[PDB]
Amino acid sequence: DIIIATKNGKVRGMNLTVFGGTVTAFLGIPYAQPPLGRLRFKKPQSLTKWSDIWNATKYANSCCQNIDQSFPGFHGSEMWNPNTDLSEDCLYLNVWIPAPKPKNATVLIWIYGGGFQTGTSSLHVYDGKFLARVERVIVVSMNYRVGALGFLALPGNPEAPGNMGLFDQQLALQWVQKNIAAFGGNPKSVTLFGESAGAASVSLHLLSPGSHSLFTRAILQSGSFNAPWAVTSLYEARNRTLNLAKLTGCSRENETEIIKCLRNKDPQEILLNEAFVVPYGTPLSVNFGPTVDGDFLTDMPDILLELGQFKKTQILVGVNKDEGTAFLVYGAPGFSKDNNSIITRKEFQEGLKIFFPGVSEFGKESILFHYTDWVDDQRPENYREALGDVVGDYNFICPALEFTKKFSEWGNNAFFYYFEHRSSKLPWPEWMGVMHGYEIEFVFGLPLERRDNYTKAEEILSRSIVKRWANFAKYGNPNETQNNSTSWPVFKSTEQKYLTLNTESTRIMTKLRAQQCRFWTSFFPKV
Amino acid sequence: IIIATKNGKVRGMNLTVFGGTVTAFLGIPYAQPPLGRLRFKKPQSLTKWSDIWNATKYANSCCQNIDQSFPGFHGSEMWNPNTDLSEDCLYLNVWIPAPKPKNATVLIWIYGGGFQTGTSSLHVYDGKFLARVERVIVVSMNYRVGALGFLALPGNPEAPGNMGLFDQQLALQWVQKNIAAFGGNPKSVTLFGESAGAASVSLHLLSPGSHSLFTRAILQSGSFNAPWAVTSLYEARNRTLNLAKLTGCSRENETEIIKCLRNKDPQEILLNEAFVVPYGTPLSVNFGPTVDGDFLTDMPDILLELGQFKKTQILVGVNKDEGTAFLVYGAPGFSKDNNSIITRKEFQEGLKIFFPGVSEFGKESILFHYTDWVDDQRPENYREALGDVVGDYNFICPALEFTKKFSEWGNNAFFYYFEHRSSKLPWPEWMGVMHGYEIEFVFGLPLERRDNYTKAEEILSRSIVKRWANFAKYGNPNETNNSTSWPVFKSTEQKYLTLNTESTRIMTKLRAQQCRFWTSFFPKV
Ligand SMILES: *[C@@H]1O[C@H](CO[C@H]2O[C@@H](C)[C@@H](O)[C@@H](O)[C@@H]2O)[C@@H](O[C@@H]2O[C@H](CO)[C@@H](O)[C@H](O)[C@H]2NC(C)=O)[C@H](O)[C@H]1NC(C)=O
Ligand SMILES: *[C@H]1O[C@H](CO[C@H]2O[C@@H](C)[C@@H](O)[C@@H](O)[C@@H]2O)[C@@H](O[C@@H]2O[C@H](CO)[C@@H](O)[C@H](O)[C@H]2NC(C)=O)[C@H](O)[C@H]1NC(C)=O
Ligand SMILES: *[C@@H]1O[C@H](CO)[C@@H](O[C@@H]2O[C@H](CO)[C@@H](O)[C@H](O)[C@H]2NC(C)=O)[C@H](O)[C@H]1NC(C)=O
Ligand SMILES: *[C@@H]1O[C@H](CO)[C@@H](O[C@H]2O[C@H](CO)[C@@H](O)[C@H](O)[C@H]2NC(C)=O)[C@H](O)[C@H]1NC(C)=O
Ligand SMILES: O=S(=O)(NC[C@@H]1CCCN(Cc2ccccc2)C1)c1ccc2ccccc2c1
Ligand SMILES: O=S(=O)(NC[C@@H]1CCCN(Cc2ccccc2)C1)c1ccc2ccccc2c1
Ligand SMILES: *[C@@H]1O[C@H](COC2O[C@@H](C)[C@@H](O)[C@@H](O)[C@@H]2O)[C@@H](O)[C@H](O)[C@H]1NC(C)=O
Ligand SMILES: *[C@@H]1O[C@H](CO[C@@H]2O[C@@H](C)[C@@H](O)[C@@H](O)[C@@H]2O)[C@@H](O)[C@H](O)[C@H]1NC(C)=O
Ligand SMILES: *[C@@H]1O[C@H](CO)[C@@H](O)[C@H](O)[C@H]1NC(C)=O
Ligand SMILES: *[C@@H]1O[C@H](CO)[C@@H](O)[C@H](O)[C@H]1NC(C)=O
Ligand SMILES: *[C@@H]1O[C@H](CO)[C@@H](O)[C@H](O)[C@H]1NC(C)=O
Ligand SMILES: *[C@@H]1O[C@H](CO)[C@@H](O)[C@H](O)[C@H]1NC(C)=O
Ligand SMILES: *[C@@H]1O[C@H](CO)[C@@H](O)[C@H](O)[C@H]1NC(C)=O
Ligand SMILES: *[C@@H]1O[C@H](CO)[C@@H](O)[C@H](O)[C@H]1NC(C)=O
Ligand SMILES: *[C@H]1O[C@H](CO)[C@@H](O)[C@H](O)[C@H]1NC(C)=O
Ligand SMILES: *[C@H]1O[C@H](CO)[C@@H](O)[C@H](O)[C@H]1NC(C)=O
Ligand SMILES: *[C@H]1O[C@H](CO)[C@@H](O)[C@H](O)[C@H]1NC(C)=O
Ligand SMILES: [Cl-]
Ligand SMILES: [Cl-]
């Protein structure tokens, strides 16, 4: 029988057969009191103690969230939708342990993305059994509250203070500290990693003093807090709180009556109004996300970064080749996943209106001018690819590069990567390229499974990335082997070297998309 | 089998070597691990252990950056560490003839690696052949490299400089207090080393605290007066502060700088070592020996001219093509994968990379002196000139100058010029007889006939092996009847012995016309 004694009680797991070995899995451990009833919109309350044995043998409920139904039946969009029932009672975590039990294993803690409005740790692409099996690491992941239930903010009011989903994540890290030894893991060797809004969350744990003792190192995939979508100003968030009140007939004279009113709405009545709190949004709108709450964040994060007030540790950062393409088929004119989306100069100008709704006509012209110095005038694909790059540079690449620059300037080793391989099984069309989110399956080792019809090159790439990630967690250095391997050098703000990841050649290069990023850092803010 | 050292018992291993047996002790600890509060400090003497230490595997190599310019390539990876890296690395190895001798001369090897890399467990430093064929006891030790071994704030015991030099000194101390228990003679000990190991050896000649720890010295392709060998206290101060800024460790206080640096991950020290110098070259020594006021009481060249050093017999030499290895770590037009033919303009660009602070006039004068072609048709003329510039300035001419001055104090000195290119050499033919590729002949590797060496290579390696062990035992590098006698190097005739498979001649005034530039004109540009 598979039983571990946690400080809240005993849990029962399951045995999994992975590559002729075993992985012990405990799926669905609770780490907090369910945020029901009067605990709606409050920080997670710590768990008590049960006397039974909790049966951690299935994934648990996913937190309440709207679903993406833009392409019914499409594996492309549906692989991100929740694969367990939805409920407000969702504060559960999973643990994958290598067999035979380790004695001081390094722990990798995954934090999913989803614009802070969607996501769940139970998705097939976040399956930590391969990492446990192949690299002997413990893998942990948690469900955290998304949308208004996760990030509604009346700043300074404990009834709805903001950043609750981030405190959710933080509590799960507290659990790993208190309990992971009992499973064989070293609480002094804990590496957070996440993707997109999960990576933005990981960068915010670097800034937040209450997290500093809960992990060792950070891995940020396709996101950072200084991305234009990741943080809301303190008073833009309280404004959206009040318009959600109005949208459900909860406008009141004092804030705590507002909250008491919101607490008796049914989740669906809240999720049904979340889109409407922003006047005019883009496909990258975060309706309810991290804010300056005075608690988890004591200042706008760009200030803390500049002043050097953050955890001093090693980081691993990178981005994908085609971050922007996914968002074009969610609101730009002339774009479909089912045709090759050749657009015109004026469709391109309408695209920019979709993604830059508040920008002047001169600013939209300067973006267009910077992105139309074609190598070949036709190339019908010019304007289609230009728009993908505008979205991808402004929203993911240039901020990740800026964060790594500023962070490395205070003396810790930083490593940067450019992921360039398109998955051979990728359900989206070819013109969308190396999309946002489609390195995750390679980070978790899914191509190591041969019955799954990936290419042998893809198994070798995924085997490499798994090794480099797990070595970075263990040693602070994303090396593969000492010989017959390209050295991944540290990213310093002068040379700015990064490693490229694909099947043909891993190369050291420098100054990734510097001529694009110079626009967003040095011209666009002045517009 | 087991031996009792003054601090506990160690257990060894049997090696079967050329029909006989060699008894090996690999990975004996000789100092406390320089960890935690001991990082950057001198080595702390060890205290007795009650168990039995098992010196049966090579130990951890000291933290160091790894040459990964050529992933897969044997010619560079054979210098990379072949045990795990760790700050816990002050171990040494001992190889003993079988059956046990009772008063064997000891040969102590100090490896090179520009003071930044290296380890005693490399295959080309395997001491079992020397013990088997000549009945000498061979020792080698790991010492700290890079900033972890040579970070200097002069006068502060928390980071004084030369810590890696004192590592070597503590290992020499262990041999004085323990080699007799193994069957060795502490009164017959010869240091030998290559490149930075050779420079290390020559500094042990100058440092009075090492005076009593050895008898004689062998210096392969290096000496302390080489331009890359010693950092000024000025340079060391600029580089320690630069490492502080690069790690986030700038403080207003020296001791706060070091308390911050003791908290850094070793990789955060290693991976910043490269940026502490603005104008680096492929021969840059980021953190090397300094005048610390302890190991070195004064500037080495002063101690040399005044005669303030251990008086004894020394054996010194260089290889024919010392410079070529460095040409593929920076110079333009050079590759291990093509014949590296270059033009006069590319030659001028190589000079820029090797001499970044030299005036345009001085770089012109380097050019002129090295372009008096015997045959001005050969397209490889400039390729050869540049390797000869680097080799003469950095290794050959400093070694000749060192041997001249050392000899003028009544000491018997012997100089050699090694010209054999190994038949197995992984690097292209144009690099010739490279830096570091006499070592495998000195350690007896070609004596193993299941190894793709040539017959001539076995015979050449057997005489070098014999001559070296003879210099250790008797103070004179003699050999067998049919064997050229090796005459003493003296300032006026300047005789040296040539080493190759064809014929070993006696010649005079090695490369005198090249070196006249580096001693008598270059110092004035
Ligand atoms: C003594 O150190 C200073 C500081 O130098 C920089 O070197 C960088 C590569 C990097 O490692 C960084 O940590 C450090 O700041 C040297 O100063 C510089 O000199 C060059 C001229 O060659 C100028 O171009 C730089 O602007 C200047 N930088 C600063 C900050 O002053 C200086 O050269 C060095 N001197 C010696 C003799 O080593
Ligand atoms: C061991 O290593 C090479 C691969 O080294 C390439 O591996 C990359 C991950 C990267 O680190 C890079 O620096 C390194 O050079 C092995 O090579 C490859 O071998 C497979 C078959 O096993 C071929 O299908 C590939 O085309 C080939 N890629 C190359 C050569 O770039 C190789 O087997 C081995 N090399 C040696 C010298 O032992
Ligand atoms: C990757 O590089 C790291 C260096 O950062 C290697 O780390 C040492 O690893 C061993 C385990 O084999 C430890 O016992 C040492 O203490 C580590 N030392 C340091 C300074 O980190 C690691 O072994 C390398 N891994 C591979 C597969 O090459
Ligand atoms: C697991 O590994 C840790 C180190 O990461 C061990 O902790 C030791 O080192 C700590 C450094 O942070 C110090 O607190 C102590 O020297 C030591 N901690 C102790 C003895 O509790 C930890 O012991 C390991 N646990 C094992 C091997 O079971
Ligand atoms: O809460 S979200 O609305 N999630 C819904 C998304 C809409 C964008 C496409 N997909 C995800 C996706 C991923 C890959 C490939 C196909 C589809 C569904 C949201 C909102 C802002 C973000 C801002 C940044 C990143 C993610 C964000 C997610
Ligand atoms: O240890 S190093 O830091 N590494 C750079 C070297 C460049 C020389 C080629 N190799 C080693 C090598 C050896 C032989 C033949 C092929 C290759 C790697 C270093 C740094 C300064 C030096 C200065 C002087 C001498 C040696 C030095 C070594
Ligand atoms: C805050 O937001 C206000 C938005 O008002 C709106 O009405 C609500 C109900 C929603 O449906 C939104 O779509 C509407 O835009 C702004 O009117 C106000 O100026 C903002 N700022 C401040 C400082 O109040
Ligand atoms: C959890 O399940 C318990 C039953 O264990 C069951 O019996 C054991 C031996 C295994 O076979 C297991 O797979 C079976 O499901 C119940 O007795 C217990 O009440 C359950 N606990 C809770 C909290 O529901
Ligand atoms: C779990 O796996 C272990 C080790 O592989 C095995 O000994 C045991 O029988 C399994 N227990 C189950 C399936 O309950
Ligand atoms: C040393 O190795 C021997 C090999 O025979 C082993 O028996 C012994 O347990 C080891 N002792 C140690 C590590 O103290
Ligand atoms: C060798 O060892 C003996 C051991 O008694 C010692 O007396 C002698 O001085 C040593 N020296 C030499 C040069 O052999
Ligand atoms: C160095 O500065 C620290 C800062 O408080 C101080 O405690 C220490 O005594 C200082 N030491 C010297 C020698 O100035
Ligand atoms: C040798 O190779 C290097 C790098 O590949 C190149 O720059 C150089 O021009 C080549 N030289 C010749 C003669 O082919
Ligand atoms: C000698 O060469 C052969 C192939 O040519 C190789 O297999 C063998 O291992 C080599 N010898 C040694 C000692 O490596
Ligand atoms: C493809 O996408 C939509 C299909 O509804 C359409 O508006 C767009 O113009 C189409 N483009 C083509 C077919 O090139
Ligand atoms: C070396 O090893 C054995 C094993 O202990 C030792 O007794 C003997 O002196 C040597 N001889 C052989 C054949 O190993
Ligand atoms: C060389 O070794 C010693 C030292 O001079 C001497 O006794 C011996 O006879 C010499 N042998 C030859 C062959 O020169
Ligand atoms: Cl996502
Ligand atoms: Cl060397």
Numbering used by the authors:
A (entry chain A): 3 to 529
B (entry chain B): 4 to 483, 485 to 529
Question: Could you share sentences copied from the article?
Answer:
Cholinergic neurotransmission in the brain is terminated by the hydrolysis of ACh, which is catalyzed by two cholinesterases (ChEs): acetylcholinesterase (AChE) and butyrylcholinesterase (BChE). In specific brain regions of these patients enzymatic activity of BChE is increased. Altogether, these data suggest that BChE is a potential therapeutic target for restoring ACh levels in the brain and thus improving cognitive impairment, while also minimizing adverse effects in patients with progressive AD.
The crystallographic structures of huBChE in complex with compounds 2 [-(CH2)2-OMe], 7 (-H), and 8 (-Me) were solved. The type IV inhibitors revealed that variations in the N-alkyl substituent on the sulfonamide nitrogen were permitted for maintained inhibitory potency against huBChE, although its removal was not. As observed already in the complex structure of huBChE with compound 128, no conformational change is undergone by the enzyme upon binding of compounds 2, 7, and 8. This observation suggests that the active site of huBChE is fairly rigid upon binding and that tailor-made compounds are required to achieve potent huBChE inhibition. As both the R and S enantiomers of these sulfonamide inhibitors provided a fit to the electron density maps, all of the inhibitors were assigned to the R-enantiomers, on the basis of a possible cation-π interaction between the positively charged nitrogen of the piperidine moiety and the side chain of Tyr332, which is not possible for S-enantiomers.
